[PDB]
Write a protein that binds this ligand. Structure first.
Ligand SMILES: CC(C)(C)c1cccc(CN[C@H]2CS(=O)(=O)C[C@@H](Cc3cc(F)c4c(c3)C3(CCC(F)(F)CC3)CN4)[C@@H]2O)c1
Length: 374
């Protein structure tokens, strides 16, 4: 509570990410910035690229300082390169402070900006270890914490819908955004927001795989990604098992690949025939775990075109990526200070009549440490 300045400060178009309003420079230039717990660079467009609504103009900033060094970041999805500097940054619908963060002024890019999107930059919320050019470049939230008395902690409530909304509470937790209790899983290493998944159930049936497979080569919480991404073998077992639960109908190969939609007459979507999915996460206490459960309403994204949906669980090059499909069911707390991530059922999650998202525990799981890849 007492974080209503910040409630509902996230916007976006579904499948195009969530962004938050920010100001940089003196005088303050407003930009919409993509919120990404999957990287650690703060970067903005700095030139009149045709896709951009606005861009960062350093000429205008009296507080701008050049850093004279270049920087290059290749994501899976895309790539940019720019010039480093520092400036005064603030989040209007956040806590009224201002910090001197590093900024990547994007001078060239490819497949990074979305033609049609309403954002112009990316805010890397993860740790310095994975910042570019190297961990010497202080990530934004590190700067925010060192320079103010704002608590080393933030939380995201992403609410799945063309338009999408959500909240980023900075420095706090807002208890009206979740129901039930928060359960914490350890942040395994401070680079990505890495975690250990110790077990997976589909409608309640263990997928029966060595838990190490769930996390090769790592599992992370990534707000800049849309899908629940599973490692290849795990992905196979999962889809196989979902087909079985939904055999009451059957669908084209391409649906399970996310390349072809499936539609029903509006309001007749056979929700009951799709299984709830569960990830057990390592808990705070030795041999203790807990479970998060998402409904089909989370992994079937609606798409315009009847009621049509895209299958939004997909295969992963890395380990497990808990992206938007996962986060839109839960209030996620990034407790950097206590080095742990918190999950609670979201106040804004989409649920049907008979079933609901869940965070439950505790469970007994031995050898949880063995689920990690080393
Ligand atoms: C930054 C670093 C450490 C070098 C790094 C390299 C590879 C993977 C990762 C893990 N986090 C990644 C996972 S990703 O590449 O799928 C999305 C990426 C952020 C990202 C980068 C883009 F060029 C684009 C998007 C997101 C968009 C917008 C939002 C979306 F979710 F709709 C998706 C599309 C459009 N293009 C995350 O940061 C970090």
């Amino acid at each position: 509570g007492s974080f209503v300045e910040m409630v509902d400060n996230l916007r976006g178009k579904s499948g195009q990410g969530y962004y938050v309003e920010m100001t940089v420079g003196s005088p303050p230039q407003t930009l919409n910035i993509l919120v990404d717990t999957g990287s650690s660079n703060f970067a903005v467009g700095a030139a009149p690229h045709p896709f951009l609504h606005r861009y960062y103009q350093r000429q205008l900033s009296s507080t701008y300082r050049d850093l004279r060094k270049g920087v290059y970041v290749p994501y899976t999805q895309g790539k940019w390169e720019g010039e480093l500097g520092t400036d005064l940054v603030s989040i209007p619908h956040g806590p009224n402070v201002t910090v001197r963060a590093n900024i990547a002024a994007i001078t060239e890019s490819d497949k990074f900006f979305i033609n049609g999107s309403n954002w112009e930059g990316i805010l890397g919320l993860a740790y310095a270890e994975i910042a570019r050019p190297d961990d010497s470049l202080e990530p934004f939230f590190d700067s925010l914490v060192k320079q103010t008395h704002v608590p080393n902690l933030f939380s995201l409530q992403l609410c799945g819908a063309a338009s999408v909304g959500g909240s980023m509470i900075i420095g706090g937790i807002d208890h009206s955004l979740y129901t039930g209790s928060l359960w914490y899983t350890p942040i395994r290493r401070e680079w990505y927001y890495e975690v250990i998944i110790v077990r997976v159930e589909i409608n309640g049936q263990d997928l029966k795989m060595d838990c190490k497979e769930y996390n090769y080569d790592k599992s992370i919480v990534d707000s800049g990604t849309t899908n629940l991404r599973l490692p290849k073998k795990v992905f196979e077992a999962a889809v196989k098992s979902i087909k079985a639960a939904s055999s009451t109908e059957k669908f084209p190969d391409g649906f399970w690949l996310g390349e072809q939609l499936v539609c029903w007459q509006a309001g007749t979507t056979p929700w009951n025939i799709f299984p709830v999915i569960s990830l057990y996460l390592m808990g705070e206490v030795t041999n203790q775990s807990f479970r998060i459960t998402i409904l089909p309403q989370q992994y079937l994204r609606p798409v315009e075109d009847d009621d049509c949906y895209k299958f939004a669980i997909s295969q992963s090059s890395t380990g497990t990526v808990m992206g938007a499909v996962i986060m839109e069911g839960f209030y996620v707390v990034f407790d950097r200070a206590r080095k742990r991530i918190g999950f609670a059922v979201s106040a804004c999650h989409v649920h049907d009549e008979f079933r609901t998202a869940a965070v439950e525990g505790p469970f007994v799981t031995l050898d949880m440490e063995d689920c990690g890849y080393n």
